[PDB]
Amino acid sequence: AKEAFEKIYGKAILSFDGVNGYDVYNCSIPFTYDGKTYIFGRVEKKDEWVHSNSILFEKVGENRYRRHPASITYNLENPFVVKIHGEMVFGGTHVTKNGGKVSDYRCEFYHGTPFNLKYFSSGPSKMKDIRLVELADGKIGIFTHFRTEGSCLTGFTTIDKVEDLTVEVINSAKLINHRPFGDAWGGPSQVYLLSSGLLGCISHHGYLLDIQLRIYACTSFVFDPATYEVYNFKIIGTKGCFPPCEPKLPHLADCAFVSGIEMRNDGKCNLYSGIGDVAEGYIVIDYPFEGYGKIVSDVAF
Amino acid sequence: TKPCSLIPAKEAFEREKKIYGKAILSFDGVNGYDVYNCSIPFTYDGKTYIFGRVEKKDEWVHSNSILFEKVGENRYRRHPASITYNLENPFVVKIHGEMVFGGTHVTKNGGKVSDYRCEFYHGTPFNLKYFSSGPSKMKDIRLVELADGKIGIFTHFLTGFTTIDKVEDLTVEVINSAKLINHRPFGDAWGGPSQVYLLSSGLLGCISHHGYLLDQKDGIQLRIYACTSFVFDPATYEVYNFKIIGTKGCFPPCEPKLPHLADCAFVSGIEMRNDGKCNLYSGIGDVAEGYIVIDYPFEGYGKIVSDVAF
Ligand SMILES: OC[C@H]1O[C@@H](O[C@H]2[C@@H](O)[C@H](O)[C@@H](CO)O[C@@H]2O)[C@@H](O)[C@@H](O)[C@@H]1O
Ligand SMILES: OC[C@H]1O[C@@H](O[C@H]2[C@@H](O)[C@H](O)[C@@H](CO)O[C@@H]2O)[C@@H](O)[C@@H](O)[C@@H]1O
């Protein structure tokens, strides 16, 4: 609601080459494959709305990524990755239009190796916020976000195998205790298995500050799959924490759309976020799940 | 019982056809994947291009559409600058001075196909912008710029036809309200529009796919696809000159993706040659793209005046 978060140990905006100067934002977390670092980016012209594609970028230098020409691209917004049963699960939002107007959107899921991803399922109509994680016992955890009916409710369910991911499973997910989130809307960008067996969630939450301001903040919480309880909900980042950048339009002046965290050698983490729907940056923050266990999941493909 | 009405015409075509040449296209830069069910070739900025459906031979419904630049005779390579499209069966047309690009976007549920619709993009060939989808489970939607500057739309429910003023006006509602064309020439064949051309007469030259299920005495069931053409009067919805113009056996040999596709040619369209004949491009056996050199199929109804010179 009104927290008192406004310590950062460093910050940067990433540079992206090979996309004709287009904006790149709302990225996946970085991942490794075959001795290199990669990231998926949402690529869009600054002056175009709902004209995104998701592109695979290879890290080529400090804070610098270049489109990898071998990879196919995906007709998707807000790409994301996770490791399930030793392979990549990749997703994003596929937008349908009717005569230029958005009419539908759904999450599309791919699995395989990073240069050989195969489409296997979509989530339900008008559900953007779906994230997967491998649980300690090898089941697959699924976070869902029920947004269509004016409500903003988060669900959680499990499946045994990734090709069991269906509309029916997602739609029937049991609701989590959402009372910690208050009037915020959103959900996880990246979910992590912790050494405790709990799940560390790095999430995006939106608020109207009261005419209103739209705020999109980087948040975290810890989730217990055994009880459906939520712990330690907090704000961990805002757009003002990142280096300045002119937002895509003025109404996005307080918009950070989180990507996720990466652990550092020094025990702190890089919090990656889309900012202003124009850029990707990171801030260096304290480990947000401190006391609930260390991250044991990885994106080392 | 009720053998498809098209079988006699298919058999007669195989007896009576005139083929002046043939080739299978070669594709570089897709890791040995199959490339089939292409767009027609087009030109842009002094080069020749074609969009291809790219899929591993032993994978079903795992396609992407890739832009290929022409390297040499019958040879194309993936153009690395282009984005790729998560689509089957890509196609192009020129409308109001720009490219309209389309293909089929497949939705799955737990690995199983649950839906598919045509997605449309517009712009220049390396800068295509998504603007609309057709209705659920309608693959074969084709556009053409009419003699009067309106946009003609062919639909498949039975083939329908309707018009719009500007490409942004292409909606599910417009497509679903299309009036049915004269069905009587087509009989009981399954089929759909492929590339549509404006003719100098103001009529439309339509390249189409038509086919049927064939049970074989001892053999397995084939899904025949043949390359067909007809001429269409947009004022009356009348169809002229419906005929077969290509079959898989006309093209160079290629082992089909699965045995039921041993007589599947899924047409792409025609390209005029300097000698007044045409290259008929087709997907063959869902594994390759080829062309056969044929007589101009709209002979007597006017010259093609539409273009894909972008
Ligand atoms: O713009 C802030 C925030 O809003 C949501 O997406 C918007 C836009 O990015 C997207 O093209 C359309 C259609 O899907 O929806 C929203 O207008 C978020 O999901 C996120 O993308 C964005 O940062
Ligand atoms: O396979 C013959 C012919 O059939 C249709 O497509 C098939 C297949 O290629 C496609 O992946 C799926 C899902 O759309 O549908 C059909 O099984 C045609 O549309 C054409 O693509 C193909 O040559």
Secondary structure of residue A159 in the 3-state scheme: strand
Which of A191, A135, A132 minimizes the C-alpha distance to A162?
A: A132
Separation CA A161–CA B73 (nearest Å): 47
Q: Residue A220 forms beta bridges with which residues?
A: A202, A234
- Write the CA distances from B309 to A154, B130, B144, B275, B306, integer angstroms: 51, 21, 14, 19, 9
Task: Please give the structure tokens belonging to residue A48.
Answer: 């175009």
The residue nearest atom 11 of ligand 1, judged by CA position, is A50
- N- to C-terminal Cα separation, chain A: 38
What experiment produced this structure? Answer: X-ray
Mutate to test the interface with A, among B85, B101, B109 (most CBs of A within 10 A): B109
Q: Residue A88 forms beta bridges with which residues?
A: A83, A112
- Order across the sheet with B151-156: list the strands: B142-145, B151-156, B159-164, B179-180
Put residue B287 in one of left, alpha, beta given phi > 0 → left and psi -120 to 50 → alpha: alpha
Put residue A277 in one of left, alpha, beta given phi > 0 → left and psi -120 to 50 → alpha: left
Separation CA B306–CA B91 (nearest Å): 15
Separation CA B265–CA B281 (nearest Å): 9
Give the count of beta carbons closer than 10 Å to the beta carbon of residue B288: 24
Identify which of A76, A97, A167 has the shortest CB distance to residue B109: A167
Residue type, A76: L
Q: Is the dihedral of CA A152, A155, A161, A165 positive or negative?
A: negative
Q: Residue B199 forms beta bridges with which residues?
A: B304
Angle at A184 between CA A178 and CA A185, to 5 degrees: 85
- DSSP letters, A165-220, are --HHHHHTPEEP--GGGTT-EEEEEEEEEBTTS-EEEEEEEEEEE---EEEEEEEE
Contact between chains at B110 and A98 (C-beta distance less than 8 A): no
Q: Give the DSSP letter of residue A295.
A: B
> Which residues in chain A are followed by a discontinuity, with C-to-N distance exceeding 2.5 angstroms?
6, 210
Tell how strand B26-28 and strand B75-78 pair up.
Answer: parallel
Buried b (16+ CB within 10 A) or exposed e, A158-180: ebeebeebbbebbeebeebebee
Q: Is A167 on the interface with B (CB under 8 A)?
A: yes
Angle at B190 between CA B184 and CA B196, to 5 degrees: 75
Q: Is the dihedral of CA B13, B15, B17, B22 positive or negative?
A: positive
Report the separation in Å between the CA atom of A65 and the middle of ligand 1, taken as the mean of its atom positions: 23
Q: How far is B108 from chain A (nearest CA, A)?
A: 5
Identify which of B105, B109, B169 has the shortest CB distance to residue A99: B169
Task: Please give the structure tokens belonging to residue A112.
Answer: 């395989």
Secondary structure of residue A290 in the 3-state scheme: coil
Residues belonging to chain A:
301
Q: Cβ neighbours of residue A152 under 8 Å, at least 6 residues apart?
A: A145, A146, A178, A181, A184, A185, A186
**Resolution (Å) of this entry:** 1.5
- DSSP letters, A217-282, are EEEEEEEETTTTEEEEEEEEE-GGGSPP---SSGGGTTBEEEEEEEE-TTS-EEEEEEETTTEEEE
Contact between chains at A166 and B86 (C-beta distance less than 8 A): no
Identify which of A74, A75, A120 has the shortest CB distance to residue B108: A120
Q: Are B29 and B78 in contact (CB under 8 A)?
A: yes
Q: Cβ neighbours of residue B187 under 8 Å, at least 6 residues apart?
A: B4, B5, B6
- Write the CA distances from B297 to B6, B92, B190, B231, integer angstroms: 18, 20, 21, 9
Q: Are A143 and A129 in contact (CB under 8 A)?
A: yes
Q: Is B5 on the interface with A (CB under 8 A)?
A: no
Question: What's CA B58's distance to the chain center, in Å?
Answer: 23
Task: Tell which B residues from 96 to 115 touch A, by Cβ distance under 8 Å.
Answer: 105-111, 114
Report the separation in Å between the CA atom of B245 and the middle of ligand 2, taken as the mean of its atom positions: 21
Secondary structure of residue B136 in the 3-state scheme: coil
Separation CA A189–CA A29 (nearest Å): 9
Q: Are A126 and A147 in contact (CB under 8 A)?
A: yes
> Which residues in chain B are followed by a discontinuity, with C-to-N distance exceeding 2.5 angstroms?
157
Q: Give the DSSP letter of residue B258.
A: S
Q: Domains in chain B, start-ordered, CATH in brackets? A: 1-310 (2.115.10.20)
Q: Are A233 and A181 in contact (CB under 8 A)?
A: yes
B-chain residues near A164 (CB < 8 A): 110
